[PDB]
Amino acid sequence: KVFGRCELAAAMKRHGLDNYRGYSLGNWVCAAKFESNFNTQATNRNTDGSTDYGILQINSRWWCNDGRTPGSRNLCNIPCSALLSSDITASVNCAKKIVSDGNGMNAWVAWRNRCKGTDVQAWIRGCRL
Numbered sequence: 001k002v003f004g005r006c007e008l009a010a011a012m013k014r015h016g017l018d019n020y021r022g023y024s025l026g027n028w029v030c031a032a033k034f035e036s037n038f039n040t041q042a043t044n045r046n047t048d049g050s051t052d053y054g055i056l057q058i059n060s061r062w063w064c065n066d067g068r069t070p071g072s073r074n075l076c077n078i079p080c081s082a083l084l085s086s087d088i089t090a091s092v093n094c095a096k097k098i099v100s101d102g103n104g105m106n107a108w109v110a111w112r113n114r115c116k117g118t119d120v121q122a123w124i125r126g127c128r129l
């Protein structure tokens, strides 16, 4: 599913991601924009053989099981395919663990390089939230 911007903002807010670990909703929408272009089915292979999955490009190196990242962890205790669903619940629940691991949203390179320090509120501007 390719979310609309305000649609994703509303879904993230409903799932408790707005202001989670101090990160406003615009930060999460911006992260999803540049990680996945709002596409829940996004996947990208990393140089180490791991794969990033879903709207927040969560890495099988640590967070989910895809059966093809030998030696990796599954800290969210989910199959990586669950991060590709049209329902964002699994991605949100796992993102909450990631952003709590000590590095905040720096866990998302695209957030650090394209959202951090910018006017992230623009990503929720105009939405009925």
Ligand SMILES: [Cl-]
Pocket (backbone or CB within 6 Å): 024, 025, 026, 027, 120, 121, 122, 124
């Ligand atoms: Cl915001």
Ligand SMILES: [Cl-]
Pocket (backbone or CB within 6 Å): 065, 066, 067, 068, 069, 070, 071, 072
């Ligand atoms: Cl694996």
Ligand SMILES: [Cl-]
Pocket (backbone or CB within 6 Å): 011, 086, 087, 088, 089
């Ligand atoms: Cl959803």
Ligand SMILES: [Cl-]
Pocket (backbone or CB within 6 Å): 021, 022, 103, 104, 105
């Ligand atoms: Cl932080």
Ligand code: NA
Pocket (backbone or CB within 6 Å): 060, 061, 062, 063, 064, 065, 066, 069, 072, 073, 074
């Ligand atoms: Na894994």
